[PDB]
Amino acid sequence: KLSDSKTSNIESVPIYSIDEFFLQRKLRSELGYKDTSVIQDLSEKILNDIETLEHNPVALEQKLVDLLKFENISLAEFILKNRSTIFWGIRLAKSTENEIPNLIEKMVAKGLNDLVEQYKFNPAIPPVIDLEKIKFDESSKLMTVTKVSLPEGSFKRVKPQYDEIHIPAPSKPVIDYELKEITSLPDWCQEAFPSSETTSLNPIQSKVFHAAFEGDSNMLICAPTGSGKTNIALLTVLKALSHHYNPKTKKLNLSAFKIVYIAPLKALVQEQVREFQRRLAFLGIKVAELTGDSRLSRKQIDETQVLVSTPEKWDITTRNSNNLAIVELVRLLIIDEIHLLHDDRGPVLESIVARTFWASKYGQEYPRIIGLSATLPNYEDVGRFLRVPKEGLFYFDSSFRPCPLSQQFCGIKERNSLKKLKAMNDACYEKVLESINEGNQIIVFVHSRKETSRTATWLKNKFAEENITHKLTKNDAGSKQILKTEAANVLDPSLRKLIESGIGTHHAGLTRSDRSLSEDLFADGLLQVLVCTATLAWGVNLPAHTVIIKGTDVYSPEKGSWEQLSPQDVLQMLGRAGRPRYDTFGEGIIITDQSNVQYYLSVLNQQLPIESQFVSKLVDNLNAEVVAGNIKCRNDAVNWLAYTYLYVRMLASPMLYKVPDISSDGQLKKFRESLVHSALCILKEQELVLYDAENDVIEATDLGNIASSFYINHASMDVYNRELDEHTTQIDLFRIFSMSEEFKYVSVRYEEKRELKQLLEKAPIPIREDIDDPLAKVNVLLQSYFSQLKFEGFALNSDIVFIHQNAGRLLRAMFEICLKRGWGHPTRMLLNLCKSATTKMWPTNCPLRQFKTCPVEVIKRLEASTVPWGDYLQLETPAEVGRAIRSEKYGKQVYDLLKRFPKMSVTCNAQPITRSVMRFNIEIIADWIWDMNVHGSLEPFLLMLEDTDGDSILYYDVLFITPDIVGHEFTLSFTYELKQHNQNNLPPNFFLTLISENWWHSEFEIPVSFNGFKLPKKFPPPTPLLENISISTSELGNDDFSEVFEFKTFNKIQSQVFESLYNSNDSVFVGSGKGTGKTAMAELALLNHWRQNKGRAVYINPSGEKIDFLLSDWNKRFSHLAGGKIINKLGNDPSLNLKLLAKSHVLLATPVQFELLSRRWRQRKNIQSLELMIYDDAHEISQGVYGAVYETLISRMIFIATQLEKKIRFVCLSNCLANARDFGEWAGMTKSNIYNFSPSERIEPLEINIQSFKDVEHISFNFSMLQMAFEASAAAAGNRNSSSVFLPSRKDCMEVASAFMKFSKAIEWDMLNVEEEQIVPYIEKLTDGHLRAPLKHGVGILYKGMASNDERIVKRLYEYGAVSVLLISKDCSAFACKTDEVIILGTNLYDGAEHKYMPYTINELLEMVGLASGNDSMAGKVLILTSHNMKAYYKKFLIEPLPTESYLQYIIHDTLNNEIANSIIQSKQDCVDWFTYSYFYRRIHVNPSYYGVRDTSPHGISVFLSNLVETCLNDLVESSFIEIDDTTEIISTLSNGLIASHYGVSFFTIQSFVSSLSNTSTLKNMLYVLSTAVEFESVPLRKGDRALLVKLSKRLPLRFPEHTSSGSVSFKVFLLLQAYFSRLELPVDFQNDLKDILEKVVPLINVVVDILSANGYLNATTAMDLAQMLIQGVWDVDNPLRQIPHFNNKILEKCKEINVETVYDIMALEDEERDEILTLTDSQLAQVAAFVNNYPNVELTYSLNNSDSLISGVKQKITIQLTRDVEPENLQVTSEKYPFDKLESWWLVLGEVSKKELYAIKKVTLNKETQQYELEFDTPTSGKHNLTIWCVCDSYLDADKELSFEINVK
Known part of the structure; x- marks a missing residue:
C-alpha cells in the first residue's frame, strides 16, 4: 500500500503476513540500507530489545529511536504498534517444533489476544536483444538484390546532363479463358456493373472470378498498375451478400452482416466510399467512411453495412474492447495495397491480420480475407500470411495492364545544387515537349506544394520563349474559344494567366471550385499538361497519356530530413498513366538522381522485396494485446506472433532478419520466446505492464490501457509518466509535450533560426529552452498554431502541420494520464489545452469565434473590451445584445447564438449515509437552444468533484447531453468514501465542477455541503450467536403443531429467537439475512397467537408473490388444525377487503393495502380489535414511497395501541440492518428481544465473487462479462451444481440464450445436461414459441408475463435437472428459484425517467444473492459482474448493511392531509405530536445531516419539524385541501384533500387534476388528464419503446396532445389505455406495463x-x-x-x-x-x-x-x-x-x-x-x-x- 505517509492499514500488521523475512525487508526498504549485513545485525538488536525489555512501549520507543537513528519514526511506530505481533510472528514462521511451544508461551504471556486475532483471520533464461540490430540498416533502399533484370527491347541512351534508360511497353497477353459477359452474371447483381463501354470483365477480373464470386476462399490478388480494383472488390462483396439473401424473398437481410475495406490514405478511402455508395445503392445497402475521428460516432455507425477506412482507424476500432460487440458481424475484409507491409505502416496491417486469426476463441469463423497487391516478389509468403491457398493465389505481370505502360528513367549526373534545378527542368521540358509534340496530353508530379506553380511558370515562360503553339490549341476555332471563353478564368488565383497557356495546376490548397473547374479543363482536352501534387494520385481519377515525375526527393518531418519518394506513391502516381479505351499504350517517365537509378527500377519491375517492419513497433502492438487480456504469459505472445508476416518471412529467410539459430528451433519457438520476453521486460521497466519474469505472469496497468486505447507510442507514454509532476503548471506542459517520441528528430535548422527567434522572443507562454534546441522549436510552433500564424518556408510549414496533426491525440493521452492519477490542475489545464489544440484559439479569445456562422466585426470589439464574457449570456433580449456589440444588424444574429450557446445551471448537496461514506446528490438544468447545425448529435461534459484546494480529484465522470434532455433538468448521485483525514476533522467545502469537453468558457463549478454536518457515529456491533444444537418441534405444546415444520430440528439462527416468539407475547424484532428462514419464523408468532386464542392476525408484506404463495400454503397446513380461515387481499376493492378482514381470522396484505384500511381506524372497529401484526421484509420501509406508507402503517398501529390503550403485538421480520436500536425503540420493542444479526451469519456457506470491468458503467453489459459468466456457469454445471443467471431484461435473456447456443455448440461442454431423446415431448408445450429452439439446446428462460404453463414446465424442468443453465429476467427475482450457484450479469438497467442507465440496489441484489445453497457440504456460490464505479459500493454494503433511513419526508402532504381528514390532527402542534410516533422522527435525530436539518442541535431539529409542517400546511391550504380556522387555531379538511384521503391519491395528482379538469372537458381530455397522475411514475419506460408507441398511435384514433413530451410515461399510459379499450394486440412488455397501469386506475377515475x-x-x-x-x-x-x-x-x-x-x-x-x-x-x-x-x-x-x-x-x-x-x-x-x-x-x-x-x-x-x-x-x-x-x-x-x-x- 503506497502512500507519502503512514495509514492505519499500513501501520497494523496481521500475523499471517509476517513471514520469516518480513522485518529485515521492512527495515531495509524503509531505512535505505542496500547492504544486507547492516540490517541483519540491526534487526537482531531490535528484536532483542523487544524481547528482553520488561518495561513498556515508551522504553522500547526510546531504544528504537536510538537503534533507528532518530529518524524514520514511522518505522519505529510500525514496530511499536506490532511489537508482540511481529516479535512472535517472526518466530512462529521458523518451525512447527518451535511453534508448538511458542503458542503456549505466547498464551501464558497474555498474548492470547494476538493468537485469537491470528485464528480470526519455470525454466526461464532471459536473453537480452538489441532492437536496433534487428531492424533494417539499409534505410530507404530495401534492395536485397543488386542484380536487376530488364526485358529485352530496353536500352540506355546517354545525354549531356543525364542518362535515359528506357523500357518498351509490354506485349498483349494470350489468355486461354473466355471473359464473363456483363449479362452472363446472376440476376440480382446486374446493376453492380454499369452499362459499360465494353460490357465485359477484363482478363485479370475474369481469371479471379471463380474464387472471387462463386467460391468463398481467402485470397491475394497481385496485379499491375491500375487493375480496376473496384470491380474485383465488388465481385467478392456480391458473394458475401449471398448467404444473407432470403431464399424466396426478393429482399436482403441488412442485419447480422457487415463488410470492411482498408485503404492507405483517407483520400482514396473517400474515393472508394463514393465509388461504392451509388454503385451499390440499388441493393438498399448504406456505405460509410468510418468516422474514426470520433469515438462517440461508433455507436450510430451500426446502421451502415459497408465500412471503408484507414488501417489506423480500424486498428484503434478493433483494439478498443467496447467495439467487440460488432466485430463478429463482419464477414468480408478487403485490404487494399497490402504491399505496404514493407512500409512503416506494415506492422499495423500485420497487427490487424494477427488480431483476426488470434482471438477467434468462440467464433470459429474467420472473415473472408482478401488482399489486393501490386506485383512484387514474396507474394508467396503473403499467401501463408493471409491464409491464401493456390485456388485464390493469383499473380499478373505488366502484360495484363489494361493499358501497357512504357518506362523511361532519367538519371541526372550533376554535382551542383542549382544546376540540378535546370537538369530537372530541361529534362522535364524535353519530355513535356516530346509527348505534347506527339499529339497527346501529359501529367506531372512535383515533390512539394507551391512547386506545382513554380514549375508551371517556368514551363509557360520556356514555351513563350519559343513555340507556344502545341499547347495553345488543337483547333483555334473550336478549342481556343472555350480556352478564351469559359475555360478562360473566373477563378481568383494567378491561374488567371497560367490557364490561358493551356497548362493545369492541381495544388492541394486551391479552392474546391477552382480545382473542379481546373481539372474539368484537363479532362475535356483543353489543357495539354497538368502539373499537380501527389494528392491527385490518391483522390480524383483523372487519367493522362504520359505521366512525368519531377523531384522524387521529398521531405519527411518524422525523420527531420529528406528521403526518396516511397514506392507506393510512385505506383499510385503511375496509377494515372494511360487511357484504356482511347490509347493503345500509355507512358511513365521519371526524373531522379543517378544515385537512385536502380531503386525506382526495382520498384517498377518486380524486384523490391516485401519485408516486415513489425519489430519497429513490436513493443506497441504487444502492449495492446496484453491490455485486451489476450496475453497473460509468454507463450500467449509466442503463439500470437505466429500469425504475423514477420514470422513467415523469418521462416522463409532467416539470414535477412538475422535469426541466429533456425537449425535447432525450425519453428522459431525459442526465438519468439526471447523476443517476447525482450519486449515484455521493456514494457515492464517502463511501467506499462506488470510482469513477473521468473514465474510468468503479466498484468496490464492504467498506463498500458491509456497507451493502447489512445494509440500512443510507448516512449512518449514513458516520457509523460516520468516527466509529469502533480505540481506541473502550464509552462512545463508544453515542454513535456515537446519531448514526445513523435518529435524525436525535429532538427532546428539554422536557416529557420532567424524566423523562429522572432516568434520565440514574443511567445505568450514562457519557453526556458534556447533557440538552438528542438524542444523550443516544437513549443514555439504549437503556440504559433494556437495563434494560427503563417510561415513562408516549406520546412517550417510541413513541421507545424505534422505537429498540429499529432498534437490532438498526444494531448488527449496526457489528459487521460493526468485524470487517472487524480491531479486537478494538470487535467483542468490540459482539457482547455486540448480545446485550444482543436479550436485554434486561446482562452483569452471569445467563444463567439468558435461558431462557423458568426459576426466577424463583433468579436474583435469584445476581445478588446476587458468585459467579462459571462456577462453577455444573461442579456435576455436582442436589444441589449445589439447594444453590447454596437450593431442592430448583427445583434439580431448573435442574439440567436447566445441563446444557442451551451450553458447550464446546477445545484447539489451532501448526504452522509454513514461515518466513512458521503453521498453526493446533484440537480442540473441545461439551458440552450439545440441548433443541430453546430452542436451535432451530442455534447459531452466533464463532471469533476475535487477538494478545497482544487488539487486532488475526489470523483470524476462524463455526462452526455443529448437534444431531448435540454430544458428537462434532472438529477444524479454518487458515492465517495470520506477521506480518513476529513472523517475525523470536518473540512469547509468541496468543489463540484462541470466543464464542456469542447466548448470554451462553458465551465461552471459550485461548492458542496459546507454549511456544517454531523457524521453518523460509527455503527455499534451486531449480536453474534452462542452455541445451539437446540429447539425442536416437541417444545411446541400441541402435537398438531409439530407436524407443520416437519424438520424436527430448528435452523441455527432460527432457534435462537424461539423463546421470545413462541412463548413471549411481547413486541419483537428479528433482523436475519435473506435466505436464512424468517418465513418459518413468522409462523411461530401465529401459532402462539392461536394456541392462546387471542384474536385477529394481520400479516404485512410488500412482496406480492410471497403473499400469493403463503395463502395457498397456509390453508393447507394451518386452517384445519385449529379452526382458522386464511385469505389474502386485492387492494383494488377496499370494500371487499374490509369484509374480508371482518370475515377472516388471519389475513395477508401489502403495506399500502392494509394502510388503506387503517387510515380510518377511528371508524372501523375491526382495526383496534387486532392484537397481532407481523411485519415481514420490514427493511423496505426505506424503499421509497410504498415504504414510506409501510412506515406510516406501523406508525399508525402504534398510535392506535397508544390512543386506545389496548396494546398490540408487533412481530417485525427483516434482513440485516445497521443500528437496529432506532427501529426497536420506534416499534415499542422490548430492548431485550430486538435481535439483529450480521450478513455473515448465514446458516450455510456463501462465496461471493465480484469482478470489475472497464467502460460498462454506462451500459447493461459487455462481451467479456458474458464470456466470464458462461465460463463460470458451465464450469459450475460441470460439477453438478446448476447455475442461475440474472439479467436486466427479457431481450437480454433471449440474446444470451443465443449466445449460449453458439458458445456451447463450439466447445467440449455443450450438453442439455440430460438425454437428447427423452426430452422431446416437452417441446410440444409451446404456449410461447420464443422458448422453442433455445430450451431445445439446454438453456431455461424465465421472464415477466410468462404463460403459467411455460413457467411450470421450465421451472420444473430446471428442478428435474433437465437444464443447469437458467436465465432469469431481473423482474422475476420474485420467482425465487433457489439454486446451487447464482450469477449476476450486469448491474445497470436503462430508465427513461432519469434519461440514463440506473444501477441495481442493495435489496434487489441481495434478494438475488439469497438464492444460494450448495448441495449439503457444498458452499453456495455467487458471481456478480459490474463496473468499476460500483464494485467498491457493493462489496462495502453487502458485508456491512446499509443504514435504513426514512423516505417519509416526501409523503408529508398525503399523510398530514389524511390525518387532518379524520380530524385526528386539528392543530399545528398535533402534527408534530403525530410525528413523534414515526421512524423518521427517531431517525432524524441520529443523522440530521441526511434529512437536510438546518441545525444539528435537537432544537434545530424541532425547528426543522415546525418549519416543515408550516410549509406543508400552507401548501395544503393553498390548493384548498384544508381550511385553517384562525383563533389556539383549528384546522379542518376540505373537498379536494378529503377526496385525496378517501381514495388514496397523491396531493399533486389531485392538484394537477383540479387545475386541468374543466366544465368544458370531454372524454378524451379526461383520459389525457387521467394519464398524467403521479401514480404512473412507477410504470416502466424501456429504452426506445417510444418507437413502438408511435407505431400504436397510428392504430388508435385519439391523439395525444402535441404540446407535451412523448418521452414521458403519460404518453405510454394514454396510448396503452386506448389499446386496452380497443382490445388491440400488444407485445409481451406492454401487456405487463398495461396490467401495472390498470392496477392503479379504479380509485383514480373515481377521483376524477x-x-x-x-x-x-x-x-x-x-x-x-x-x-x-x-x-x-x-x-x-x-x-x-x-x-x-x-x-x-x-x-x-x-x-x-x-x-x-x-x-x-x-x-x-x-x-x-x-x-x-x-x-x-x-x-x-x-x-x-x-x-x-x-x-x-x-x-x-x-x-x-x-x-x-x-x-x-x-x-x-x-x-x-x-x-x-x-x-x-x-x-x-x-x-x-x-x-x-x-x-x-x-x-x-x-x-x-x-x-x-x-x-x-x-x-x-x-x-x-x-x-x-x-x-x-x-x-x-x-x-x-x-x-x-x-x-x-x-x-x-x-x-x-x-x-x-x-x-x-x-
Whole structure:
C-alpha cells in the first residue's frame, strides 16, 4: 500500500503476513540500507530489545529511536504498534517444533489476544536483444538484390546532363479463358456493373472470378498498375451478400452482416466510399467512411453495412474492447495495397491480420480475407500470411495492364545544387515537349506544394520563349474559344494567366471550385499538361497519356530530413498513366538522381522485396494485446506472433532478419520466446505492464490501457509518466509535450533560426529552452498554431502541420494520464489545452469565434473590451445584445447564438449515509437552444468533484447531453468514501465542477455541503450467536403443531429467537439475512397467537408473490388444525377487503393495502380489535414511497395501541440492518428481544465473487462479462451444481440464450445436461414459441408475463435437472428459484425517467444473492459482474448493511392531509405530536445531516419539524385541501384533500387534476388528464419503446396532445389505455406495463368524477362512462354484447341475425339457440354464464316528498327508491379483461340537462334487492325546470337507467 505517509492499514500488521523475512525487508526498504549485513545485525538488536525489555512501549520507543537513528519514526511506530505481533510472528514462521511451544508461551504471556486475532483471520533464461540490430540498416533502399533484370527491347541512351534508360511497353497477353459477359452474371447483381463501354470483365477480373464470386476462399490478388480494383472488390462483396439473401424473398437481410475495406490514405478511402455508395445503392445497402475521428460516432455507425477506412482507424476500432460487440458481424475484409507491409505502416496491417486469426476463441469463423497487391516478389509468403491457398493465389505481370505502360528513367549526373534545378527542368521540358509534340496530353508530379506553380511558370515562360503553339490549341476555332471563353478564368488565383497557356495546376490548397473547374479543363482536352501534387494520385481519377515525375526527393518531418519518394506513391502516381479505351499504350517517365537509378527500377519491375517492419513497433502492438487480456504469459505472445508476416518471412529467410539459430528451433519457438520476453521486460521497466519474469505472469496497468486505447507510442507514454509532476503548471506542459517520441528528430535548422527567434522572443507562454534546441522549436510552433500564424518556408510549414496533426491525440493521452492519477490542475489545464489544440484559439479569445456562422466585426470589439464574457449570456433580449456589440444588424444574429450557446445551471448537496461514506446528490438544468447545425448529435461534459484546494480529484465522470434532455433538468448521485483525514476533522467545502469537453468558457463549478454536518457515529456491533444444537418441534405444546415444520430440528439462527416468539407475547424484532428462514419464523408468532386464542392476525408484506404463495400454503397446513380461515387481499376493492378482514381470522396484505384500511381506524372497529401484526421484509420501509406508507402503517398501529390503550403485538421480520436500536425503540420493542444479526451469519456457506470491468458503467453489459459468466456457469454445471443467471431484461435473456447456443455448440461442454431423446415431448408445450429452439439446446428462460404453463414446465424442468443453465429476467427475482450457484450479469438497467442507465440496489441484489445453497457440504456460490464505479459500493454494503433511513419526508402532504381528514390532527402542534410516533422522527435525530436539518442541535431539529409542517400546511391550504380556522387555531379538511384521503391519491395528482379538469372537458381530455397522475411514475419506460408507441398511435384514433413530451410515461399510459379499450394486440412488455397501469386506475377515475361532481359539473356523467370502459375493457360505443366474455366476432355477427343487442336477450335466449351460437369451450361458457347471470337489472322509482311546493333556494329533499329483480348472491364483477376484484357500485345523479348543472349525486352499493336513499338539492332559480335523474353502474355497460321530470320554483 503506497502512500507519502503512514495509514492505519499500513501501520497494523496481521500475523499471517509476517513471514520469516518480513522485518529485515521492512527495515531495509524503509531505512535505505542496500547492504544486507547492516540490517541483519540491526534487526537482531531490535528484536532483542523487544524481547528482553520488561518495561513498556515508551522504553522500547526510546531504544528504537536510538537503534533507528532518530529518524524514520514511522518505522519505529510500525514496530511499536506490532511489537508482540511481529516479535512472535517472526518466530512462529521458523518451525512447527518451535511453534508448538511458542503458542503456549505466547498464551501464558497474555498474548492470547494476538493468537485469537491470528485464528480470526519455470525454466526461464532471459536473453537480452538489441532492437536496433534487428531492424533494417539499409534505410530507404530495401534492395536485397543488386542484380536487376530488364526485358529485352530496353536500352540506355546517354545525354549531356543525364542518362535515359528506357523500357518498351509490354506485349498483349494470350489468355486461354473466355471473359464473363456483363449479362452472363446472376440476376440480382446486374446493376453492380454499369452499362459499360465494353460490357465485359477484363482478363485479370475474369481469371479471379471463380474464387472471387462463386467460391468463398481467402485470397491475394497481385496485379499491375491500375487493375480496376473496384470491380474485383465488388465481385467478392456480391458473394458475401449471398448467404444473407432470403431464399424466396426478393429482399436482403441488412442485419447480422457487415463488410470492411482498408485503404492507405483517407483520400482514396473517400474515393472508394463514393465509388461504392451509388454503385451499390440499388441493393438498399448504406456505405460509410468510418468516422474514426470520433469515438462517440461508433455507436450510430451500426446502421451502415459497408465500412471503408484507414488501417489506423480500424486498428484503434478493433483494439478498443467496447467495439467487440460488432466485430463478429463482419464477414468480408478487403485490404487494399497490402504491399505496404514493407512500409512503416506494415506492422499495423500485420497487427490487424494477427488480431483476426488470434482471438477467434468462440467464433470459429474467420472473415473472408482478401488482399489486393501490386506485383512484387514474396507474394508467396503473403499467401501463408493471409491464409491464401493456390485456388485464390493469383499473380499478373505488366502484360495484363489494361493499358501497357512504357518506362523511361532519367538519371541526372550533376554535382551542383542549382544546376540540378535546370537538369530537372530541361529534362522535364524535353519530355513535356516530346509527348505534347506527339499529339497527346501529359501529367506531372512535383515533390512539394507551391512547386506545382513554380514549375508551371517556368514551363509557360520556356514555351513563350519559343513555340507556344502545341499547347495553345488543337483547333483555334473550336478549342481556343472555350480556352478564351469559359475555360478562360473566373477563378481568383494567378491561374488567371497560367490557364490561358493551356497548362493545369492541381495544388492541394486551391479552392474546391477552382480545382473542379481546373481539372474539368484537363479532362475535356483543353489543357495539354497538368502539373499537380501527389494528392491527385490518391483522390480524383483523372487519367493522362504520359505521366512525368519531377523531384522524387521529398521531405519527411518524422525523420527531420529528406528521403526518396516511397514506392507506393510512385505506383499510385503511375496509377494515372494511360487511357484504356482511347490509347493503345500509355507512358511513365521519371526524373531522379543517378544515385537512385536502380531503386525506382526495382520498384517498377518486380524486384523490391516485401519485408516486415513489425519489430519497429513490436513493443506497441504487444502492449495492446496484453491490455485486451489476450496475453497473460509468454507463450500467449509466442503463439500470437505466429500469425504475423514477420514470422513467415523469418521462416522463409532467416539470414535477412538475422535469426541466429533456425537449425535447432525450425519453428522459431525459442526465438519468439526471447523476443517476447525482450519486449515484455521493456514494457515492464517502463511501467506499462506488470510482469513477473521468473514465474510468468503479466498484468496490464492504467498506463498500458491509456497507451493502447489512445494509440500512443510507448516512449512518449514513458516520457509523460516520468516527466509529469502533480505540481506541473502550464509552462512545463508544453515542454513535456515537446519531448514526445513523435518529435524525436525535429532538427532546428539554422536557416529557420532567424524566423523562429522572432516568434520565440514574443511567445505568450514562457519557453526556458534556447533557440538552438528542438524542444523550443516544437513549443514555439504549437503556440504559433494556437495563434494560427503563417510561415513562408516549406520546412517550417510541413513541421507545424505534422505537429498540429499529432498534437490532438498526444494531448488527449496526457489528459487521460493526468485524470487517472487524480491531479486537478494538470487535467483542468490540459482539457482547455486540448480545446485550444482543436479550436485554434486561446482562452483569452471569445467563444463567439468558435461558431462557423458568426459576426466577424463583433468579436474583435469584445476581445478588446476587458468585459467579462459571462456577462453577455444573461442579456435576455436582442436589444441589449445589439447594444453590447454596437450593431442592430448583427445583434439580431448573435442574439440567436447566445441563446444557442451551451450553458447550464446546477445545484447539489451532501448526504452522509454513514461515518466513512458521503453521498453526493446533484440537480442540473441545461439551458440552450439545440441548433443541430453546430452542436451535432451530442455534447459531452466533464463532471469533476475535487477538494478545497482544487488539487486532488475526489470523483470524476462524463455526462452526455443529448437534444431531448435540454430544458428537462434532472438529477444524479454518487458515492465517495470520506477521506480518513476529513472523517475525523470536518473540512469547509468541496468543489463540484462541470466543464464542456469542447466548448470554451462553458465551465461552471459550485461548492458542496459546507454549511456544517454531523457524521453518523460509527455503527455499534451486531449480536453474534452462542452455541445451539437446540429447539425442536416437541417444545411446541400441541402435537398438531409439530407436524407443520416437519424438520424436527430448528435452523441455527432460527432457534435462537424461539423463546421470545413462541412463548413471549411481547413486541419483537428479528433482523436475519435473506435466505436464512424468517418465513418459518413468522409462523411461530401465529401459532402462539392461536394456541392462546387471542384474536385477529394481520400479516404485512410488500412482496406480492410471497403473499400469493403463503395463502395457498397456509390453508393447507394451518386452517384445519385449529379452526382458522386464511385469505389474502386485492387492494383494488377496499370494500371487499374490509369484509374480508371482518370475515377472516388471519389475513395477508401489502403495506399500502392494509394502510388503506387503517387510515380510518377511528371508524372501523375491526382495526383496534387486532392484537397481532407481523411485519415481514420490514427493511423496505426505506424503499421509497410504498415504504414510506409501510412506515406510516406501523406508525399508525402504534398510535392506535397508544390512543386506545389496548396494546398490540408487533412481530417485525427483516434482513440485516445497521443500528437496529432506532427501529426497536420506534416499534415499542422490548430492548431485550430486538435481535439483529450480521450478513455473515448465514446458516450455510456463501462465496461471493465480484469482478470489475472497464467502460460498462454506462451500459447493461459487455462481451467479456458474458464470456466470464458462461465460463463460470458451465464450469459450475460441470460439477453438478446448476447455475442461475440474472439479467436486466427479457431481450437480454433471449440474446444470451443465443449466445449460449453458439458458445456451447463450439466447445467440449455443450450438453442439455440430460438425454437428447427423452426430452422431446416437452417441446410440444409451446404456449410461447420464443422458448422453442433455445430450451431445445439446454438453456431455461424465465421472464415477466410468462404463460403459467411455460413457467411450470421450465421451472420444473430446471428442478428435474433437465437444464443447469437458467436465465432469469431481473423482474422475476420474485420467482425465487433457489439454486446451487447464482450469477449476476450486469448491474445497470436503462430508465427513461432519469434519461440514463440506473444501477441495481442493495435489496434487489441481495434478494438475488439469497438464492444460494450448495448441495449439503457444498458452499453456495455467487458471481456478480459490474463496473468499476460500483464494485467498491457493493462489496462495502453487502458485508456491512446499509443504514435504513426514512423516505417519509416526501409523503408529508398525503399523510398530514389524511390525518387532518379524520380530524385526528386539528392543530399545528398535533402534527408534530403525530410525528413523534414515526421512524423518521427517531431517525432524524441520529443523522440530521441526511434529512437536510438546518441545525444539528435537537432544537434545530424541532425547528426543522415546525418549519416543515408550516410549509406543508400552507401548501395544503393553498390548493384548498384544508381550511385553517384562525383563533389556539383549528384546522379542518376540505373537498379536494378529503377526496385525496378517501381514495388514496397523491396531493399533486389531485392538484394537477383540479387545475386541468374543466366544465368544458370531454372524454378524451379526461383520459389525457387521467394519464398524467403521479401514480404512473412507477410504470416502466424501456429504452426506445417510444418507437413502438408511435407505431400504436397510428392504430388508435385519439391523439395525444402535441404540446407535451412523448418521452414521458403519460404518453405510454394514454396510448396503452386506448389499446386496452380497443382490445388491440400488444407485445409481451406492454401487456405487463398495461396490467401495472390498470392496477392503479379504479380509485383514480373515481377521483376524477368526484372532482367533477363537486362543482356541480354534469360532466361527471362522462368520467363515469369512462369508468365502465376501464372495467370491461371496451369502448362504450360498441355492441353491448362485446363486453361479454369470449363473444368473438362470429357470435357477435350471429347475434345480428337473431336481432339480439342487449345482454338480457342472451340469458333469455332459448337453449336450442345457444347450441348454434355458443361454440365456446366449457370453461369459456362457464365464464359467459358467470358474466351473464350476474349482469344486473334495476328499476328506478323517484318519489319526491312534494312535487310542487319548494321554496326558492331551499334544500329540498327527494327520496329515490332503487329496486332489483332478484336478491344478488354476489356483487363480484366479472370481466375477462380487468384482472382484479371489484364491487358492483352505482351512481345516483340528479341534474338539469339544459344548464349542464348537477344538483345532487350519491355513490351507493346496491346489495339488497330493494332499497331507497334520501338526497337533498338546492331548489334552482324561480320558474320551471327540467330535472333528470340518472342511475348508472360503474362496472358494467348498458345497464344504466334514467328518469326525467318538471319542477316549478317560487
